[PDB]
Design a binder for this molecule. Structure first.
Ligand code: 1YE
Ligand code: 1YE
Lengths: 182, 182
């Protein structure tokens, strides 16, 4: 199953590399730049999983109530496949009624980019119906991996959502805040 | 299947992003740094695909005849999923009979790390046998993707090989040299 393999890949090649040092990076950020931020960023990593697999090039553009505010201090890879590689993470502002309502580290789950591209490419042999099914199966698989993984205990949060195609009322901002507020 | 999704993820999440600008970066390096080099590093990215899925932490240690030379001046991602990740690429010299026989930018295919880890974890439900099967499938699928891909025409070489299991009449540098020699 492609989702099975992608979920494992996203854990083995990203999450288990980034999550162990995340809180420290955040705790650190909250010290050096507390006077600049005048706030605290939350300590979990929030992973957006849109099941329609639409991943915009700039999160800061997908909802106008989500603005980029800063990057986290960098981490350098000292491990197979990422030796001397530089990872950063972005911090975002969440707006409600034009005002900051929360601050968090936010990103889209990259394998969704792959699911979407496989549905667009002939050579992948992968239909739109294949895509939504595999996206749900990806999210369930990743949940199971995380629920029992040494690195992902209490520092990661999966935000899965399906855009009702009927209206444009849906708010990514509100969705994130729903999870945020606890 | 796992390998099929992984080859696509690897193309979509890495190769399509690093290949287009690779050839410019190597020509830049060839021209700017000709005094040091007294040679030309070759123009393609060479991708080690050990079928046993053994990826070391340190490439340079794998073979006494593969030696670190330099880093390629970097490239910062400017697309969906990769704003400001900094990729590091290394140039290596290949020795034959104690003498420099070639110079190329070399790395291991990261999804092999995932196939290996999947065969270690019981939750992934993946046997050692599945692993070899998927490794071959991964290489063949990646081949077919690259053959048709516009952004990866004449700038990429897959080096797939099988180490004799325990005895070690294997030279990684000979494997790389054999491909490089065209
Ligand atoms: C831009 C992009 C697109 C797709 C993937 C991906 O499918 C994928 C699947 C498994 C693991 C990774 C690694 C990562 O997210 O850094 C992946 O990265 C991708 C990236 C970085
Ligand atoms: C350390 C490590 C391990 C496994 C993968 C991976 O399976 C994988 C699968 C698809 C795409 C990527 C992205 C990349 O190679 O940068 C992947 O990256 C991995 C990395 C970076």
């Amino acid at each position: 199953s492609v989702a099975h393999g992608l979920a494992w890949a996203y854990y083995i090649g990203y999450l288990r590399l980034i999550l162990p040092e995340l809180q420290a990076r955040i705790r650190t950020y909250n010290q050096h730049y507390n006077n600049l931020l005048r706030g605290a960023v939350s300590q979990r990593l929030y992973i957006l999983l849109p099941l329609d697999c639409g991943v915009p090039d700039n999160l800061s553009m997908a909802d106008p109530n989500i603005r980029f505010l800063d990057k986290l201090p960098q981490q350098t890879g000292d491990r197979a496949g990422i030796k001397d590689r530089v990872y950063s993470n972005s911090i975002y502002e969440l707006l409600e009624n034009g005002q900051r309502a929360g601050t968090c580290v936010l990103e889209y789950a990259t394998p969704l980019i792959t699911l979407f591209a496989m549905s667009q490419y002939s050579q992948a042999g992968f239909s739109r119906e294949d895509r939504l099914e595999q996206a749900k199966l990806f999210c369930r698989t990743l949940e199971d991996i995380l629920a029992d993984a040494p690195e992902s205990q209490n520092n990661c949060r999966l935000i899965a959502y399906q855009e009702p195609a009927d209206d444009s009322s849906f708010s990514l901002s509100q969705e994130v805040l729903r999870h945020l507020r606890q």
